[PDB]
């Protein structure tokens, strides 16, 4: 039973009712930046002892940290901001969280009810603005609805297909005194009547049947399986089916396994795309057939029966029409199909060794590779050295760009919730903040943000938060002085014509600019630089052993290119494997 | 005649047609940050020599710099960004520009037409998201509409009541080749039929009549007169009417004048609010009767006939019902009324010396003041010393908070376009970026960003832009280690209970954190610190004389409070004039 | 043309809706509030400061009284045909201007507005902003229930009436003394008019009768009422028009009087769309 701070019949401010509504939801952490419209809320937060508030230096950091918190754990992210400028500063975060289906609850303070529409001071139609970029939102119009709306937001944000839910709370409601009713029922008739029911055996056995009838079965795992790590594992050790995952599904199935095809897609391995290009059966679990994974949909698995299991009906059949589909929780489906494969084991006698070898050939004929030049540090190598020194147990947060794809390719994640990257919206500046969220959600864990000089400088101000909050965040900054992924798309489709991709200072293009070391210095964060591949281990070992937050600026040659690479809309026969800017 | 880069019959990419559409609009400057969806556009920009592109380190800086560019000059601001994360990063800027009625044109790249709604990669319903926070927006659906839509955007953004206009341009359209028609007519039948016509004499003389019938006339000038500096001046030297302006109207009428009542409102002078509280005639020109200016509308000028001249009909009568109103350009109205006051001069024989004295008493009984403690630097004094050393000729950009109100109170702006502050939305982190925009728009001018430690760290990354772009931006950072305006609202209404307003490091709350000096150091920007009020002049003189960008971190005691202060919704009889946190 | 509207006058606009004030015509003086309160207020001032003011507009009133006599509302009578205007006037007369009038939309609508003198508001129920046809009969039902002991008369057009003719069933079943003065001109009057004025009188599907016998009145509105147990009659001669209307009024219960009129009639005066006072048309029809 929840021990309240107020008497069951004692009236208290709405702001207090809100905070208590969060405590009753198990919330222990929020990322809130003060403002006129949310002052009451903040005051109410200080009255709470079960909830720690991590003050960011910019709302965008707040929302991204909330995402980190969410992605790095099972709990949803909770961020709070004031009206107008505060609120609009969360917009990027919500779109990000909506595209990557991330549990999030955003509380924005609003101007008093009567002033809504009057175009008052620091007022913005936040609900209208965030309609198409959130799972659902609300505008509290009665202090008596606070309990119900908060419970409904957390429910919606974490149930079905997880998503961001924003709650606008007018200032005057925050002040209004009242006696909360924590027994009110949720008003979600439509939603509840759309919640998938446990998978039926008729559908599950129909799949197992297709497996036994297949000769080239390939698992296409996505971030929809992040909670089915075990079930998914048991499944593979019962079918011996090669597993290929999306960028979002990394970790679901250990990348360092024998049956692992690693990440597939635009920048996936050549063998991962090969397996899918020639499979006769595609087991698409927890995936949404994104473009950077299929390219030309008519050429995607064109020679295979597609079984698509998804919790979201709308997703099923949207891009690629399945042969067999199952609208439901992938975890339940897995446990089910596992039982059938366990009993009817001998009867089935599944063997895909022939397929596995056909692939094991491509896997050795086109493995992930990187070139080393003189004593320069190869970003890929750096990451590998990190995987090594952290024994693949580190939680990685990332920015967006080349450095992002490498962190995805050269690190072997043991479990999900270990890889926190912006994939659907691909928002730069995600990394550092996300690492903050991860570190708070996982105090006793190695948290490392692998950033790009572009993505990092974008939210560099969160270094202040890292210090003030005493968070052991390790920043492995792969510095290439450019906007890598963009300067790359130039050498590939625009005759290498520099389109404002240089981030250094033209007055001295030989000097590293900005000096990321001094940035950390300003925030009391110990740092170092590495340029020689030779002293790279000592470097990374130091960053890891130095207690507290740390920043390692590891210089890399910009010419590097992320390969393999299947151009936008292309096919497996368009996979590029050679080229750069040397 | 515009000399094109392509033959009148030569087909070129849509992206090229766009850029040429901007050149034909007189655009010389853009603030664009690269992305997949805008690459074609950027490439097209490099083909242009009349347009300089200033690459920011974050889109929000881009849009705020575009605002600075716009506010600091007459031209509109033009910012460009890619889809998804790039685009949502402009949201704050648009709301800001919409609330402070600022000419702005935002070009966001979108995913290919066919992929719209497919929920593709890096895709966002930008048009839907920015509907309620822009003057108007567009989604280009045909490469043949680029010429017309661009011309319509610049028209709408700069005509009537200036505002932000966003243009979404799908990627595939940017690639599509075509032959532009620069003679197409604009499709704005409704808008054109709502454009106010020149003021009628019957209405203008009705005002002049009310002036001669008044004994206590008070001018209530707002940012709607930023282009009527002369007309407004001539008017005063013909009626001798005391002038009080909004935060947005600063500069319209020289603050260092004898007839100047300075800024009125929540933080306006006591005499400015007095004059309005006891005037019998309020000449509201270019104002929108905001809350932080009237408070309780029933008590605002309750004893006076209100003449409201506005270019926006919707604004007239919205908050305060006028006795006489004029929907039209305030500049035209002024020139008109000036002629009448010039001819019927002797006949009228206007004399308000009695009124002016009644006010001149309050002006001396309650002048703007600030206290000095020991050798500590008083933020107000610092600003005054700056006004002095720059001879009131410096363009000031500001953040939001206490430091913002002081920059508004203790500096005497000679003309409009000299004070660039976020007033309607009050977005923090506006300052530095805005100064960048001002410096590019005014190369040979003293540009000084007066920031708060909170507002500054929020977009600190633009220091990289300052350096790389070689901009003589001077940052007078009033460092008080707190969120001043917020910590203030606590000592006033929350018993001084700290609600996460401390920006320093709790581990050593005696040390200045962050070290803003090192931030500039990282970006090759010379800096210094000042703590003693004694060496404050040498300090500021140095910042001004050191060629190039400069950052002066001037330490101030946080306890300071912005006075006078009329609480939210209060009246002239609620004006606070004593209190702080000593 | 808004620029020509009262272009020579100071406009005082009192409205309860702020958005309305200044929307189309910028006022010199405006008052956002209840017009009733404003009136009571201004009345007191005009009552006290009466002698002081000594208001006299006799000169103005005469200047107008000249135009009022130089261009009064008129209508022409042809042979024994019934002039729709006259019919309405005869109704105003027999009902002593105490009848609640509901109307359809079209010529017949403008005439009911011009040739009847309403004593109070809530007596004239017409669709003016949207101008929805078929409003009349139903509206009369609403009026009759809201005013049991009152003379309710729907002045309809053959077009507007047939559109909701089914409510006759409601009239009967509900026992409502609804009187239908149907001005039958066999056409879509207001529309056939806009044709003779701007389209060289080219018939654009405005004929509501049967082409197979364009001399017969179609539909037979009498039989419609017959189907619903509603007593009816027809009038064609201007001579027996009074007896007709008197009967409709005296026959207890609902009643329908189909009064035939020559379609050529035109609603005048008429200022074309967007025109000005100098565009006022006062002569023309389709004879
Ligand atoms: C620079 C850049 C390059 C990229 N390159 C690649 C690349 O080469 N390869 C690649 O894979 N991606 C790449 N991406 C990421 C890519 O855009 C997509 O975000 C990713 O492929 C989506 O993977 P997903 O469908 O598995 O995850 P999501 O998009 O998160 O979709 C998960 C799906 O699982 C469903 N689901 C959720 N929970 C459950 C449950 N309990 N039971 C059943 N179903 C559930 C959802 O409703 C949904 O349909 C790139 C992104 C960037 C920024
Ligand atoms: C911390 C903080 C404190 C604040 N404190 C104060 C304070 O104490 N006092 C104060 O004044 N403000 C204060 N503000 C600013 C305040 O919120 C409003 O932005 C400001 O009062 C608006 O002034 P304005 O109406 O003159 O300008 P705007 O809001 O820009 O409105 C201009 C008006 O002029 C009209 N107009 C435009 N062009 C023309 C033309 N050519 N001809 C005729 N009409 C035209 C517009 O359409 C509009 O109605 C504060 C803001 C912050 C962030
Ligand atoms: C907020 C935002 N702005 C612009 C983009 C466009 N973009 C897509 S990939 C990429 C790569 C560059 O960044 P960097 O951090 O330096 O890393 P690198 O790719 O060089 O490793 C960019 C700029 C984006 N995704 N998000
Ligand atoms: C983006 C954003 N976040 C939060 C607020 C709420 N807020 C309003 S005034 C204020 C004052 C504090 O900042 P600082 O820059 O340190 O200056 P000071 O007031 O101390 O001079 C704040 C945080 C805002 N206006 N914009
Ligand atoms: C429901 C509907 N359909 C069409 C119109 C277009 N319209 C406008 S005035 C008019 C006049 C014709 O009707 P009628 O009832 O015969 O009367 P008359 O004008 O002939 O007296 C018409 C058809 C309308 N206002 N409403
Ligand atoms: C798991 C189900 C319940 C899922 C996919 N279905 C909805 C969902 N539920 C809805 C319920 C009522 C009305 C509109 C809806 C729209 C959606 C939607 O697709 O966004 N939300 C979800 O998470
Ligand atoms: C940001 C968008 C505009 C970006 C990265 N996206 C595409 C893109 N363009 C495509 C064009 C045709 C068919 C499939 C595509 C898939 C993608 C994709 O990778 O999402 N092209 C681009 O430049
Ligand atoms: C100066 C006039 C033209 C002004 C105030 N009026 C509009 C304006 N013009 C419009 C024209 C057509 C349809 C809706 C509109 C809404 C507005 C509005 O108030 O936002 N825009 C302006 O700048
Ligand atoms: C951000 C909002 C919520 C902020 C600054 N705004 C008010 C506020 N509250 C008011 C409440 C009643 C009457 C007039 C007000 C005017 C304001 C105003 O100054 O704009 N109170 C606040 O806390
Ligand atoms: C149903 C509409 C389209 C109708 C009756 N309305 C007009 C019309 N057109 C106008 C065209 C220009 C200026 C003023 C007008 C006023 C009207 C009006 O009477 O409302 N023209 C028409 O045909
Ligand atoms: Mg980089
Ligand atoms: Mg400060
Ligand atoms: Mg008719």
Assess B321–C contact: CB distance below 8 Å, yes or no: yes
Residues with CB under 5 A from ligand 11 (ion): A 452-453, 480, 484
The SS3 of residue B313 is helix
List the residue whose alpha carbon is closest to atom 8 of ligand 7. Answer: A568
B248 is catalytic: no
Question: Are the beta carbons of C30 and B321 separated by less than 8 Å?
Answer: yes
Are A499 and A436 spatial neighbours (Cβ–Cβ below 8 Å)? no
Contacts with B505 from chain A: Cβ below 8 Å: 467-468, 524
- DSSP element (H, E) containing C224: helix C221-227
B6 is catalytic: no
Q: How far is the CA of B58 from the centre of ligand 3 (A)?
A: 10
Tell me which chain A residue has its CA closest to the CA of residue B453.
A57
Whose CA is closest to atom 41 on ligand 1? A329
The best mutation among B58, B399, B401, B516 to test binding of ligand 4, ranked by most ligand atoms within 8 Å of the C-beta, falls on: B401
Tokens in use for B323?
């006795």
Element (H, E) at A164: strand A164-170
Contact A79, A106 (CB under 8 A): yes
Shortest Cα distance, chain B CAs vs residue C183, angstroms? 39
B538 C-beta neighbours (distance < 10 Å), count: 11
CA distance B245 to B423: 13
A197/chain B closest Cα distance in angstroms: 26
Candidates A99, A74, A56, A223; CA nearest to A154 is A74
Q: Give Cα B303 distance to the centre of its chain.
A: 31
Q: Do B322 and C30 count as a contact with CB atoms less than 8 A apart? A: yes
Closest CA in chain B for residue A483: B34
H helices within B429-559, ranges in order?
Answer: 431-441, 453-457, 462-468, 484-493, 516-522, 536-545
- Enumerate residues 488 to 527 of chain A having a beta carbon within 8 A of any beta carbon in chain B: 489-490, 494, 497-501, 503-507, 513-519, 521-524
Q: Kindly state if the Cβ of C129 falls inside 6 Å of ligand 10.
A: no
CA dist B235 and B237 (Å) reads 6
Instruction: Determine which one of A43, A122, A175, A206 is catalytic.
Output: A122
Is the distance from CB of B541 to CB of B550 less than 8 angstroms? no
What kind and span of H or E run contains A474?
Answer: strand A473-479
E strand segments, B96-152 = 104-110, 136-139
Residues of chain C neighbouring B321 (CB-CB closer than 8 A): 18, 30-32
- Nearest-neighbour CA in chain C from B322: distance (Å): 8
Cα gap B412→B418, rounded to integer Å: 10
Taking alpha carbons only, the member of B148, B80, B79, B131 closest to residue B109 is B80
Nearest ligand to the CA of A267 is 1
The token pair that represents B405 in the structure block:
């109100």
Coil/strand/helix, residue B230? helix
DSSP string, C180-212: EEEEE-SB-HHHHHHHHHHSTT---S-B-S-GG
Asked if residue A45 lies in contact with residue A30, where contact means CB atoms within 8 angstroms, the answer is yes
User: Can the peptide bond before residue B564 be classed as cis, meaning omega within 30 degrees of 0?
Assistant: yes
- For residues B396 and B28, the answer to whether their CB atoms sit within 8 Å is no
Q: What 8-state DSSP symbol labels residue B43?
A: H
Residue nearest to atom 18 of ligand 10 (CA): C273
C-alpha pair distances (Å), A68 with each of A79, A167, A440, B545: 11, 20, 9, 45
Nearest-CA distance from B324 to chain C in Å? 5
Dmax (CA) for chain C in angstroms is: 73
Q: Which of B394, B396, B195, B472 is nearest to B313 (CA)?
A: B195
A461: annotated active-site residue? no
Domain extents in chain A: 1-195, 196-368+563-582, 369-562
Helix (H) or strand (E) holding A520: helix A516-522
Contact B136 CB / ligand 8 (< 6 Å): no
Nearest CA to ligand 2 atom 51: B423
Contacts of C21 in chain B (CB under 8 A): 317
Q: Which of B476, B484, B417 is nearest to B450 (CA)?
A: B476
State the CATH class of domain C74-267. Answer: alpha beta
> Cα–Cα distance between B301 and B275 in angstroms, integer?
9
Mutate to test the interface with A, among B29, B62, B99 (most CBs of A within 10 A): B99
Residue A123: name the closest of B61, B484, B291 by CA: B291
Tokens of C122: 């809530």
**B322 close to C (CB below 8 A):** yes
* Residue matched to tokens 């419209």: A37
Judge contact between B165 and B137, C-beta under 8 A.
yes
Parallel/antiparallel/unpaired status of strands A12-13 and A177-178: antiparallel
- Write out B185-218 in H/E/C secondary structure: CCCCHHHHCCCCCCCCHHHHHHHHHHHHCCCCEE
Rounded-to-integer distance, Cα A220 and Cα A211, Å = 14
∠ CA(B318), CA(B324), CA(B328), 5° rounding?
75
* Residue nearest ligand 5's atom 4 by CA: C133
Give the residue among A459, A550, A455, A462 at the shortest CA–CA distance from A503.
Answer: A455
Q: Which value in Å is the resolution of this experimental model?
A: 2.8
Q: Which of A405, A458, A99, A425 is nearest to A263 (CA)?
A: A405
- The four Cα atoms A308, A314, A315, A321 give a dihedral, to 10 degrees, of 60
C270: left (phi over 0), alpha (psi -120 to 50) or beta: beta
Residue where the block lists tokens 């020139």:
B335
Q: Classify the phi-psi angles of C284: left when phi > 0, otherwise alpha if psi is within -120 to 50, otherwise beta.
A: left
- The helices-and-strands tally (H runs, E runs) of chain A is 24, 20
Architecture label for domain A369-562: 3-Layer(aba) Sandwich (3.40)
Q: Is the minimum CB–CB distance between A29 and chain B shorter than 8 Å?
A: no
The fold for domain B1-195 equals Rossmann fold (3.40.50)
Q: What is the DSSP letter of B159?
A: S
Residue of B15, B30, B31, B34 best to disrupt the A interface, most CBs of A under 10 A:
B34
Q: Is C27 on the interface with B (CB under 8 A)?
A: yes
B59 is catalytic: yes
Phi, psi for residue A391 in degrees, rounded to 5: 60, 35
The residues near B479 (Cβ < 8 Å, ≥ 6 apart) are B452, B453, B512, B516, B553, B554, B555, B556
Residue in this structure with the two tokens 């020509």, named with its chain if needed: C4
| Interface mutation vs chain B, best among A96, A121, A127, A399, most B CBs within 10 Å | A121
| CATH superfamily label, B196-368+563-582 | TPP-binding domain (3.40.50.1220)
Q: What is the secondary structure of A524-547 as a DSSP string? A: T--EEEE--GGGHHHHHHHHHHSS
Rounded-to-integer distance, Cα A492 and Cα A490, Å: 5
- The answer to whether B1-195 and B196-368+563-582 have equal CATH topology is yes
**Contacts of A322 by beta carbon, 8 Å cutoff, 6+ apart:** A284, A306, A307, A308, A316
Residue in A92, A121, A483 nearest the CB of B88: A92
Ligand 4 pocket test, pick from B58, B422, B454 with the greatest ligand atom count within 8 Å of Cβ, gives B454
Total residues belonging to chain C: 287
Partner C contacted by B308 (CB < 8 A): no
- Dmax (CA) of chain B: 75
Atom of ligand 7 nearest to the CA of A292: 19
**B128 CA: distance to closest CA in chain C (Å):** 26
Contact (CB, 8 A) for A409 and A263: yes
Instruction: Copy the structure tokens of residue A75.
Output: 């709990």
Length of chain A counted residue by residue: 582
Instruction: Tell me the shortest Cα–Cα distance from A348 to chain B, in angstroms.
Output: 39
* Integer Cα distance of A175 and A143 in angstroms: 9
A175 contacts chain B (CB < 8 A): no
Q: Which residues of B15-52 are buried (b: 16+ CB within 10 A; e: fewer)?
A: bbbbbbbbbbbebebbbbbbbbbbbbbbbbbebbeebe
H/E element holding B326? strand B324-327
**How remote is the CA of residue B268 from the centroid of ligand 9, in Å?**
16
d(CA B290, CA B224): 13
Structure tokens at B422: 């976020």
* Minimum-distance CB partner of C32 among B203, B321, B327: B321
Asked if A129 and B91 come within 8 Å (Cβ–Cβ), the reply is yes
Please indicate whether residue A161, judged by its CB atom, sits closer than 6 Å to ligand 6: yes
B326 contact residues in C (CB cutoff 8 A): 26
Return residues 203-222 of C near B (CB < 8 Å): none
| Catalytic residue chosen out of the listed positions A121, A186, A393, A509 | A121
**Can you tell me whether residue A417 is helix, strand or coil?**
coil
> Could you write out the DSSP letters of every residue in C53-83?
H----HHHHHHHHHHHHHS-------TTPPP
């Amino acid at each position: 039973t929840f021990i309240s701070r107020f008497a069951p019949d004692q009236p208290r401010k709405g702001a207090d009712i809100l905070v208590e509504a969060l405590e009753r939801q198990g919330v222990e952490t929020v990322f809130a930046y003060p403002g006129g419209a949310s002052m009451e809320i903040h005051q109410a937060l200080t009255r709470s002892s079960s909830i720690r508030n991590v003050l960011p230096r910019h709302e965008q950091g707040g929302v991204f940290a909330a995402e980190g918190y969410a992605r790095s754990s099972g709990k949803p992210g909770i961020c709070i901001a004031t009206s107008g400028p505060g609120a609009t500063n969360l917009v990027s975060g919500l779109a990000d969280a909506l595209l990557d289906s991330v549990p999030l609850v955003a509380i924005t303070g609003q101007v008093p009810r009567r002033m809504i529409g009057t175009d008052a001071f620091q007022e913005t139609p936040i609900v209208e603005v965030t309609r198409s970029i959130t799972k659902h939102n609300y505008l509290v119009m009665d202090v008596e609805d606070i309990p119900r709306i908060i419970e409904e937001a957390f429910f919606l944000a974490t149930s079905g297909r997880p998503g961001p839910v924003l709650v606008d709370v007018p200032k005057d409601i925050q002040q209004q005194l009242a006696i909360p009713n924590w027994e009110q029922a949720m008003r979600l008739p439509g939603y509840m009547s759309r919640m998938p029911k446990p998978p039926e055996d008729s559908h599950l056995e129909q799949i197992v049947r297709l497996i036994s009838e297949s000769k080239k079965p390939v698992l296409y795992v996505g971030g929809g399986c992040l909670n089915s790590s075990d079930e998914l594992g048991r499944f593979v050790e019962l079918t011996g089916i090669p597993v290929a995952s999306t960028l979002m599904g990394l970790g679901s199935y250990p990348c360092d396994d024998e049956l692992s095809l690693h990440m597939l897609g635009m920048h996936g391995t050549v063998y991962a795309n090969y397996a899918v290009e020639h499979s006769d059966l595609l087991l698409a679990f927890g995936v949404r057939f994104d473009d950077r994974v299929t390219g030309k949909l008519e050429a995607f698995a064109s020679r295979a029966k597609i079984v698509h299991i998804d919790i979201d009906s709308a997703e099923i059949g949207k891009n690629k029409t399945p042969h067999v589909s199952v609208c439901g929780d992938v975890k339940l489906a897995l446990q089910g199909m596992n039982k059938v494969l366990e009993n009817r084991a001998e009867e089935l006698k599944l063997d895909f060794g022939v397929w596995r070898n056909e692939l094991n050939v491509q896997k050795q004929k086109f493995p992930l590779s990187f070139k080393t030049f003189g004593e320069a540090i190869p970003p890929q190598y750096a990451i590998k050295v990190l995987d090594e020194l952290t024994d693949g147990k580190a939680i990685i947060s990332t920015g967006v760009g080349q450095h992002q794809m490498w962190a995805a390719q050269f690190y072997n994640y043991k479990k999900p919730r270990q890889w926190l990257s912006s994939g659907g919206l691909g928002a730069m500046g995600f990394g550092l903040p996300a690492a903050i969220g991860a570190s708070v959600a996982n105090p006793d864990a190695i948290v490392v943000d692998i950033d790009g000089d572009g993505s990092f400088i974008m939210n560099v101000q969160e270094l202040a938060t890292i210090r003030v909050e005493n968070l052991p965040v390790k920043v492995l900054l792969l510095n290439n002085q450019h906007l890598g992924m963009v300067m790359q798309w130039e050498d590939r489709f625009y005759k290498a014509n520099r389109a404002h991709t240089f981030l250094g200072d033209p007055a001295q293009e030989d000097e590293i600019f900005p000096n990321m070391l001094l940035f950390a210095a300003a925030c009391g964060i110990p740092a170092a630089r590495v340029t020689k591949k030779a002293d790279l281990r000592e470097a990374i070992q130091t960053m890891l052993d130095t207690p507290g937050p740390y920043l390692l600026d590891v210089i890399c040659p910009h010419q590097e290119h992320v390969l393999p690479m299947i151009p936008s809309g292309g096919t497996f026969n368009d996979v590029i494997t050679e080229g750069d800017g040397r």
